[PDB]
Design a protein around this ligand. Sequence first.
Ligand SMILES: C[C@H](CCC(=O)NCCS(=O)(=O)O)[C@H]1CC[C@H]2[C@@H]3[C@H](O)C[C@@H]4C[C@H](O)CC[C@]4(C)[C@H]3C[C@H](O)[C@]12C
Ligand SMILES: C[C@H](CCC(=O)NCCS(=O)(=O)O)[C@H]1CC[C@H]2[C@@H]3[C@H](O)C[C@@H]4C[C@H](O)CC[C@]4(C)[C@H]3C[C@H](O)[C@]12C
Ligand SMILES: C[C@H](CCC(=O)NCCS(=O)(=O)O)[C@H]1CC[C@H]2[C@@H]3[C@H](O)C[C@@H]4C[C@H](O)CC[C@]4(C)[C@H]3C[C@H](O)[C@]12C
Lengths: 258, 513, 502
Amino acid sequence: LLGTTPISGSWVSCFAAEAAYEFQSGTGEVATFTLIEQDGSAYVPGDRAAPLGYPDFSGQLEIEVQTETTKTGDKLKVTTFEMILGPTTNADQAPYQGRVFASVTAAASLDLVDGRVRAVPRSIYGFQDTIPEYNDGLLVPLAPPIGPFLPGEVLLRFRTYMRQIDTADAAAEAIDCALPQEFVSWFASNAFTVQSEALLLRYRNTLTGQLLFECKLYNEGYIALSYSGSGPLTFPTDGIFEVVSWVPRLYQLASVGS
Amino acid sequence: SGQDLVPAAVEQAVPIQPVAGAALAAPAAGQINQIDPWIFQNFVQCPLGEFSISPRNTPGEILFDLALGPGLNPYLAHLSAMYTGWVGNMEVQLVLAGNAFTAGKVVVALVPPYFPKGSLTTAQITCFPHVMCDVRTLEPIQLPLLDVRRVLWHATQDQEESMRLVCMLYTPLRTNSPGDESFVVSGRLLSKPAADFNFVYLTPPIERTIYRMVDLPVIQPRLCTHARWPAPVYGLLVDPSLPSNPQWQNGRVHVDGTLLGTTPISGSWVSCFAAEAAYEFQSGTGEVATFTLIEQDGSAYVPGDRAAPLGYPDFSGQLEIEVQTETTKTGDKLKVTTFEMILGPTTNADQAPYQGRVFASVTAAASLDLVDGRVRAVPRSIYGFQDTIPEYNDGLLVPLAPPIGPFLPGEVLLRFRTYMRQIDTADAAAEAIDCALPQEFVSWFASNAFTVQSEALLLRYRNTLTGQLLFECKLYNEGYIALSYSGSGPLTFPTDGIFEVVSWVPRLYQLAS
Amino acid sequence: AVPIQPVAGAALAAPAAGQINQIDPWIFQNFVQCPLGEFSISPRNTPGEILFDLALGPGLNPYLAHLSAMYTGWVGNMEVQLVLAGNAFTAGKVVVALVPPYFPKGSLTTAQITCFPHVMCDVRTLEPIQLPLLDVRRVLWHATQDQEESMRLVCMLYTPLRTNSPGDESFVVSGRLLSKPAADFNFVYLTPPIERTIYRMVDLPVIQPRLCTHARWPAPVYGLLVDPSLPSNPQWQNGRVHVDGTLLGTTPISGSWVSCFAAEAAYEFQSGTGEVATFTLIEQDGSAYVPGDRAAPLGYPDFSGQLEIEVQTETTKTGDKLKVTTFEMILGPTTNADQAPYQGRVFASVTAAASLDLVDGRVRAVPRSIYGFQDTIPEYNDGLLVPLAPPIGPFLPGEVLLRFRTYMRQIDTADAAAEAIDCALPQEFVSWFASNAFTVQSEALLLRYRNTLTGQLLFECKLYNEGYIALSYSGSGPLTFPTDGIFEVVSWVPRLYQLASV
Ligand SMILES: C[C@H](CCC(=O)NCCS(=O)(=O)O)[C@H]1CC[C@H]2[C@@H]3[C@H](O)C[C@@H]4C[C@H](O)CC[C@]4(C)[C@H]3C[C@H](O)[C@]12C
Ligand SMILES: C[C@H](CCC(=O)NCCS(=O)(=O)O)[C@H]1CC[C@H]2[C@@H]3[C@H](O)C[C@@H]4C[C@H](O)CC[C@]4(C)[C@H]3C[C@H](O)[C@]12C
Ligand SMILES: C[C@H](CCC(=O)NCCS(=O)(=O)O)[C@H]1CC[C@H]2[C@@H]3[C@H](O)C[C@@H]4C[C@H](O)CC[C@]4(C)[C@H]3C[C@H](O)[C@]12C
């Protein structure tokens, strides 16, 4: 694995922490989360830039927590909070160090206990694909950029649409990844060798055996595709990638036609 | 060492002539094909080569039943991906060397081809060339396995009619030993090709063959995801004071790949659904969001052999969810909301997800108008969790997946436990939902579609920090795991070690407690 | 017996070695025991257990492990024999297989052990199973001073053990492996004998613990004891070392560096609670300190409380020049402290009423006492990262740490009972293990506390190769031992080796 990538498809873009609740009447509940590993183990700062699975996109984030309270009429409850992932140039958030601050718009002083929590993404405001604040203002270790490519190759992107709080626009907030789950698992479960610099995949539709395209899965876990067009070009998502061979770095893919 | 046992069951003159191996199929294949002369030199244990005779077995039970083939050798089951054909005999050793106090006899027959499969009672297993061997014999019992065949060679695809080798518990197993324990003689099977075994026609070596015993992922069962609720796994355990044969619907998959009921492959469909919404505001219950259900990948839902779309919450309770709805108010456009739909009958209902329609509702003061669209609802909380099947059709029967069973006397179910977010106004403990196999194994069997051999797989559970085998469980070919446990208090296991298959075992295989 | 060709030993390696050196012919006579070549099969074991796994070399024989410091190489086979201790009423098998000198690693299931050239031994055999251990190799000879890949013997429990058992013990079937050189073992080239070899067993200092020095607080050691009540898995940062000679965390070589720091004097007066000095930490040897792997400079205290360094104060005020004042330092969080030794800055505060005209220079600090001492990690950073040594574990079921308690100078206002700090290894072992740099063989030593005057054991403890001692205790009351004995290494054991209850 590289960066903060988890194995489970359920560790993604969430954290687990030992919460601490204090400004109980200024703005609401300002919770400080001492992050640990989601499997329960204690987080120790090494070469990953955050716990395993921590959200690496920038923007405000909503999280669902479990809140053991003390008031009569309710013992447990799910609570929404406010997370500030983006840089913002003023934020006491240091996921690399192990402390993360979230807040609630609350006029009262709903008091909770300091038990453990498994937070969950709910909705992102002002989404933006760029490295969030990992330290408070300082540099961290993190995975290298996704490159390089031969002259003529673009990056094949997998595209999913998220939940977004939006005041004006009404379009879908597309986020893009290199490999989906079931590919990050199925790696790191059976450990393959490499024997060369890329894999020549062959995407073809399971009906009629039509050949959609032919891509290079570079050994760093991302797919390049020799596309010389200008705008986007979407493919159907009901085919099956099939490994054809290992190809050197210089191999020249057949162009795809927009 | 003592010789109050049976010296050797030296293979009686079984009434059978010698059978030709590769000398008949040699002028009919267009290749000269030989296999390593060192594979014929040692007896290695079969892939299906592990059985056990307990005293709870009755005369007539079939201990092992293995057709002559290349599936009788780990060496030749691997070499038989490159070839299309085989011929020849095999030599099988049978290792039962039970205690000095046990008593009983097994009888190993030589069933010819085309003999109807099925019952094979104890009165008729002796009419075949057989060997009656005591379960105390010290030295292994070499017994042949001839290639009686109608044709020149067999194709390496199991639809062949080939000579079986059935073993049957002839007299029951008892023990003289004066103390409070009946030993469980556990035999093994070793095999090696005879002098003229031979494969036929080199072909491309494909991994997805009828051999190639099941593999499991090397991932700890605490990094795995759950198959009934979107969360990690927080500990596997065995509990005898629970519903023993439950009728869950998610995370239930055969070993040969075919999913069962409402189970998805993707781990983000579980407990979620995708529908087309219609919101209607009421002065009472607030909105009444009618959802017409489609599949989570886009295709429409036609009610067939599944009691609900793939991934519908298969339990009963009060599920509060999250949908991104578009409003008509000016100032904001997109908003994630929280409706609250029932699943338990609650003495009154209107939803029938078998027909493709559910009814959520939220209580709000204003006449909250929303842009009627299509949404993906994911769970957020559960209030009053009940581990029972909901009403998929209103009160009508639905096509369901069978309840998880049956187990041998003594075998409890191994449950993977995870805690869901709950709304308890008085209770303070944790609600726990249990699955049979995590979603990481359902996504692993769907993608490989193995060829199950008999009825179940031995497993282990190897610790990863100490290399210590904690227990051996039995994965039944219907995708659940039974382990022997006679205790009363719920026993819990470390969640670090990884599983690992061992062999195929029949249903009668008695485990170690 | 076994399906292997005969493997040429010293006849393939002869035309390319300067010499082929013979061995005393009385060494090919005795079967001497192999280190780690012992097991025990209880009736609770599942088939698949790996009972032993040992690699052909000269480390299997005490004669050859010692002869193999005079030479450069070796070649040839060995003869091993497995003895099993079971009567006529047991039942179970054990498969002994010859694993080639590659074939990487992992859980060998019992399906796969029968695929090597093997031997399947019933538990109730009489005479010892003899089997070869051939030298399959890619090269002509082997080098004695460099562990390489050679043929293994792996033993596995094939079918489980079926016996009766009275009430205690539970009838384990024991087994022991004993080896000797085959007729064509040879060493290669006579060199001058070296002492820092790799088949050199871990020896311990002959020093009673009462004469030792503590590792976390600079004082003598006043009592070694077990105590199932305290935190069973602490995370101390001083007195951590690896038996292979690697210092873990902020453990220093010397005992003068313990609970101490050499700092930069940055003095300035303030009219609040007194004088406050900010210290820019450095390594006490005088080398420039940079934030690295350790959670603090080497030796910085690892407890939590109110510590009071002394000085290096040069006062230019007339009357006196060099004095010894007592500062004060807070180690616990207290929710108001800029305590970050990690980055190289600490805050010290003395309660003075006037200005102390102190020159800025280079000081070093000595603890005086502690107020409110808690066995808990201090603030190496404010609330931030700390790359630190892991906790001290894990232990088997029913094993508790063996602590070397000393008593530190307590400033108290409510009682007088002396408080006990404690470490896992006195500061003599931390220097011994680093100065020798042994070679860890398996997983855990097997010490033996004896009395030098009387000559009788006190207990059998277990030094894990991670630098702490465990001990199989059953009861619950703190049981204190005499502090006048000697630790004696017996042999290497596995992790799962079960001690004798103290
Ligand atoms: C209050 C938690 C129950 C909620 C939950 O488990 N998942 C909700 C997310 S989702 O909507 O189902 O997607 C409990 C159940 C299991 C707990 C965890 C488990 O106790 C394991 C670790 C270890 C420590 O207890 C503390 C952190 C922890 C990680 C715990 C956090 C938290 O106390 C958890 C997560
Ligand atoms: C409701 C979706 C937009 C909001 C969103 O991105 N997420 C909401 C919850 S989640 O984060 O997806 O978990 C919309 C945008 C993308 C849509 C999907 C896409 O249009 C693809 C297919 C198209 C089919 O006609 C309908 C189902 C569908 C599978 C759509 C379902 C659903 O209407 C989706 C998912
Ligand atoms: C302030 C030091 C005097 C010794 C002292 O104050 N106490 C010793 C006992 S205790 O621990 O305080 O308990 C002086 C005398 C020896 C000096 C050191 C020595 O001169 C060695 C190096 C020399 C470098 O030029 C500067 C740093 C240094 C490391 C010096 C630091 C500091 O000036 C020291 C340490």
